[PDB]
């Protein structure tokens, strides 16, 4: 029922040369974008380059978006500016922004609202710490992170969730991932409704590579991934192939 | 000297079409980039579009830069990436980043360290609040802010200071050219105290309050005001007359 969703998070990496090389190798992968979503998230200043080098079967987005609209917000990219550039997706709430730049649940909410106001699709990240999982607080913490923003979703094809097992940076088994994914879908069901919950894509955002992608994707409540370091290698196409 | 320096901070504003329009109008102004620096700072995602459309006499830059290098830093743009793209200038410590995104003196320092380490030129902003000005803390505050980072400066043409009179932004108070000049004088003294006289006389100190076509000449003709980081007025085609005040 749910369309699989494979995302490349390049984070803060890339040169124009390397992007030229990587995008070319990606273009050589034959896949149908009506059946599978494949999204590339370059660094802001690399977006136009990346978009021009990637064939249209690859969707594209940016790794952050402002909680503010246009105006006196130096260094920010608004949802309105992204929409004008036909930027399709935004990443919101990535653990590294919550960690390094003190992004809160409320910031995530307001970024999501702004993104949805301007008709962007949103990739929304959350997940518990090692200390939180060690205290058996996974459901508590994820209920709270999800309820911060979940009522803003009207179209459950246009918001994609991402579970980051920050506890593991330990290493999460496919079954352990699946178990949280199921818990998340139940949270969505009880906050938004059962049809909504069965629509929404929930991606795994722990460490995904060529050797574990098949085991992860086959899990019933794992609908794809947000891929970190493996997405900077030409063998990312094999991770893509696991979802086809 | 000192070479004037006129900078367009477009902040979070612009469309593909408005920039097309605006850059074209700017291109019609004939100035000599060896006689003054004219720098445009678009939104990161507008950098390529903006750099392509502006004639090469215009310098360009980005409104923020990361304190971290390359790696697992989602949403960040490194000094490394800016260097690879020949992005010449970066803004650091803008009051709007200190206000909304909790950017600290330490953040400013590391961003400057990272920028200079990667051969970027930095436009660095600081300034006191209403409450600080009212309590006569202007020099204490500015001295603290500048001392966060000034020892990193390795070339006093390549780092540019911006005084933001935050006490006069959105407060109901307006800073006079005379008041501005005095803070700039205060700032050049601070640099002379910490770096030396030649260093202090070399460095551009730009005014970062509200600048428009009416007040621009009154500001830049002041002895210690070497140009400006312009906000809302740099979104208009009439910005060319702000540039003209420095020609």
Curated annotation (Swiss-Prot), chain A:
InterPro entries: Aldolase_TIM, TIM_sf, TrioseP_Isoase_bac/euk, Triosephosphate_isomerase, Triosephosphate_isomerase_AS. The active site is at 94 (electrophile), 164 (proton acceptor). GO terms for cellular component: cytosol. GO terms for biological process: gluconeogenesis; glyceraldehyde-3-phosphate biosynthetic process; glycerol catabolic process; glycolytic process. It comes from the Eukaryota. Its EC number is 5.3.1.1. SUPFAM superfamilies: Triosephosphate isomerase (TIM). D-glyceraldehyde 3-phosphate binds at residues 9, 11, 226, 228-229. PROSITE patterns: TIM_1, TIM_2. The keyword Signal does not apply. Keywords: Gluconeogenesis, Glycolysis, Isomerase. The keyword Repeat does not apply. PANTHER family: TRIOSEPHOSPHATE ISOMERASE. Catalyzes the interconversion of glyceraldehyde 3-phosphate and dihydroxyacetone phosphate in the glycolytic and gluconeogenic pathways. This is Triosephosphate isomerase. It comes from Plasmodium falciparum.
């Amino acid at each position: 029922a749910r369309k699989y969703f494979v995302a490349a998070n390049w984070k803060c990496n890339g040169t124009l040369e390397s992007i030229k090389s990587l995008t070319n190798s990606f273009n050589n992968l034959d896949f149908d974008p009506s059946k599978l979503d494949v999204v590339v998230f370059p660094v802001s200043v690399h977006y136009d380059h990346t978009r021009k080098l990637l064939q249209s079967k690859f969707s594209t987005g940016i790794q952050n978006v402002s909680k503010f609209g246009n105006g006196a917000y130096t260094g920010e990219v608004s949802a309105e500016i992204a929409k004008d550039l036909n930027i399709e997706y935004v990443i919101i709430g990535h653990s590294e922004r919550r960690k390094y730049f003190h992004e809160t649940d409320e910031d995530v909410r307001e970024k999501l609202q702004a993104s949805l106001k301007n008709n962007l699709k949103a990739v929304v990240c959350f997940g518990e710490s090692l200390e939180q999982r060690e205290q058996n607080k996974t459901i508590e913490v994820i209920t709270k992170q999800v309820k911060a923003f979940v009522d803003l979703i009207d179209n459950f094809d246009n918001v994609i969730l991402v579970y980051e097992p920050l506890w593991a940076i330990k290493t999460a088994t496919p079954e352990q991932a699946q178990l949280v994914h199921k818990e998340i879908r139940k949270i969505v069901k009880d906050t938004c409704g059962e049809k909504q919950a069965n629509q929404i894509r929930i991606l795994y955002g722990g460490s995904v590579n060529t050797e574990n992608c098949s085991s992860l994707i086959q899990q019933e409540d794992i609908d794809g991934f947000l891929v970190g370091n493996a997405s900077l290698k030409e063998s990312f196409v094999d991770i893509i192939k696991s979802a086809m």
